[PDB]
Amino acid sequence: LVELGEKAPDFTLPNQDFEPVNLYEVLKRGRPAVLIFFPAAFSPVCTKELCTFRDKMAQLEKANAEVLAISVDSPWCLKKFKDENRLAFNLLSDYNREVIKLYNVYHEDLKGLKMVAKRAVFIVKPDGTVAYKWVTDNPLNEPDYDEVVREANKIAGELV
Amino acid sequence: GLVELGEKAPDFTLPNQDFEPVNLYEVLKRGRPAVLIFFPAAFSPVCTKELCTFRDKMAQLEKANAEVLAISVDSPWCLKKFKDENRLAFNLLSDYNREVIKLYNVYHEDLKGLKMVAKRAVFIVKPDGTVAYKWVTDNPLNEPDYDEVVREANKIAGELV
């Protein structure tokens, strides 16, 4: 039920190394946080005329915001994916679908797989306000990191 | 949830690392026995060691003539990656819906903060669907008796000749 311009709900989740990462504590850093969701690592990504696996999610690293990618996988699975695309950021899993529901970002069914997070993005201001939002009911609809990054660099220099 | 020894194992059908439907009794119709290697989570410290061992002990597992089927609650995608990771030969089924772990009563109430996880278990269901080997650990760090697993396995493929 989280909507743009509002106060982003706080959650706590285990990262690749089972080290719990709290959102609000991340905000306390003084820069917006980019929360990218996704159904499950090592999955495909359709592009209208080009369907591959190649993950461009590592692009967000360029952005001058804290990046926290969330998936319903496990820390071990995610820990693997982090090494794959040499992701330099933190990936949090929600094996219990606790946080995905909080943002209503979830596929009640995806190829027989239930409670699978859908694609989406939420740039949260260092104060906890949703300064940006993007979501798609399409599982293979990958975000265009190019802009999401600049739209974050904006939100950053926006409220400094 | 009562997969007692001697009593027929509940038939089921799950995906594949390649999203291919697999059916228990169907696969048993091949004539060889089945081995259900349950495991908590792919890319886990012990899980990998276990299946890795299952990959390295096929010399005696193949002359046993059977059908090995590992299974966890990870997505078909996490699993597919796990296979080529250690280049396994047998199929890896996913129970993303906690269906076969609740059925075969081998689920961890909680694990490292994670809920509903397949304990580490190895069942050997002979063609006639009867369960002959039931090894279930309360501690995810305990490995099964790999040697005997193959030993008591061929002990079924033989009796069928």
Description:
Chain A has four helices and seven strands, in the order E-E-H-E-E-H-E-H-E-E-H. Chain A has helices at residues 23-27, 75-84, 98-102, 145-158; strands spanning 12-14, 20-22, 33-37, 66-71, 90-93, 119-124, 130-136. Chain A has a five-stranded mixed β-sheet with strand order 5-4-3-6-7. In chain A, strands 1-2 form a two-stranded antiparallel ribbon. In chain A, a hairpin with a 5-residue loop joins strand 6 and strand 7 (130-136). Chain A binds chain B through residues 14, 18, 40-43, 73-77, 79-80, 95-96, 111-114, 116, and chain B through 15, 19, 41-44, 47, 74-78, 80-81, 85, 96-97, 112-115.
In short:
The first copy, chain A, is an alpha/beta fold.
Write out key terms for the chains shown.
two-stranded antiparallel sheet; thioredoxin fold; homodimer; Glutaredoxin; reactive oxygen species; 21% strand; 5-stranded mixed β-sheet; oxidoreductase; 4 helices; alpha/beta; antioxidant enzyme
How many beta strands in the DSSP annotation of chain A?
7
Strand content of chain A: 15-25%
Envelope shape of chain A: globular
| Proportion of helical residues of chain A | 10-25%
Number of helices of chain A: 4
Domains of chain A, number: 1
CATH architectural group of chain A? 3-Layer(aba) Sandwich
CATH uppermost class of chain A: Alpha Beta
